[PDB]
Amino acid sequence: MRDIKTYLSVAPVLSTLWFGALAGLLIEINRLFPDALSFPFF
Amino acid sequence: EWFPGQPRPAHLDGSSPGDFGFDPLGLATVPENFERFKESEIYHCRWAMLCVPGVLVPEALGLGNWVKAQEWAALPDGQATYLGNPVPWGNLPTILAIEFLAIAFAEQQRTMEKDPEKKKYPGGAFDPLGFSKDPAKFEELKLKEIKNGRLAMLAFVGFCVQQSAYPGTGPLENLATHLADPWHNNIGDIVIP
């Protein structure tokens, strides 16, 4: 079990999941704010 | 000290009139540079001290603006005026020539003498009455000259920035205007930021 944990902590899979989460966040932001060119908050 | 708590750097152990321990850029680490800076400081403050009343006196009494006193040079036929006296040879070329010759010749013959104390403080025939009588009084009036001249240089900076922000004005004029009404005639209109 702990072996599969140390394997999961190997940079490829960690990086893939991290990048997937980041891309999901970005595409969701783009969905909720289409075309988002300026900073119309301040 | 000029600043409480901040210790004085090494090469500022008083030991000189005007030394209140202010040197944040450490230019004074070089002895020759230090003496040269003292000499140039004395020159600067002395010039500005002579040259502030040359602005004040005309500005208030019978003269006009301190900028128009030289207006004779901008236009061809300009001839200077002594409170309402256009002196026969107060024309541009003669005063230009006397300025050149006197200033250059003299300040050469005076600078080329390396006492080196006489440079900063001439004396010689400029102390026959002995206003160097009292050494305590001597250092005291030295400190006095340094302080007054620092103030005069500040005053010239103020003149510059004021005449900049107020095109074509007079120090006494702006002073009387601002004093005439306190809380809306001041630097505020100039600088919100």
């Binding site: 140390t6 289409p34 060119l37 300026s38 900073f39 119309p40 908050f41 | -």
Partner: protein, 158 residues
Amino acid sequence: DIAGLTPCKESKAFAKREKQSVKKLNSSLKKYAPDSAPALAIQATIDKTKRRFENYGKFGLLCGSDGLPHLIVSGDQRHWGEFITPGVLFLYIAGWIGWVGRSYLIAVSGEKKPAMREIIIDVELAARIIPRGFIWPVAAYRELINGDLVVDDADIGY
């Protein structure tokens, strides 16, 4: 009106671009059933680009002589919703990332062969080091104050 660039809340070529875009979209729309989900998404994108044109006509966007937005990054905070605030936001993010990475590495340096933890991250230590981002401006600050950020003559080895 910087160099004459009118905002397309008032210019015309912007309206022409908007009109032509919605026109070609609508002409494409009339080739299906008025209820087909593809046609529905087409109308959705139509109103979406429409409200985009509207939003652009709400935030002082100075607008070119050809009907296009044009940023104004000259420093005047009047047009700052383009560079200044997003710039400092991204700088905050980048400082976050740089500081957290540097701190992780400095920490994990003290092991037997740090390469084994540089290839296979100490995800526990990584998790208890990562959220420190809120300190990256101030912390590094003190570092430079205390001179514990740089080195003088240690170059190779460590």
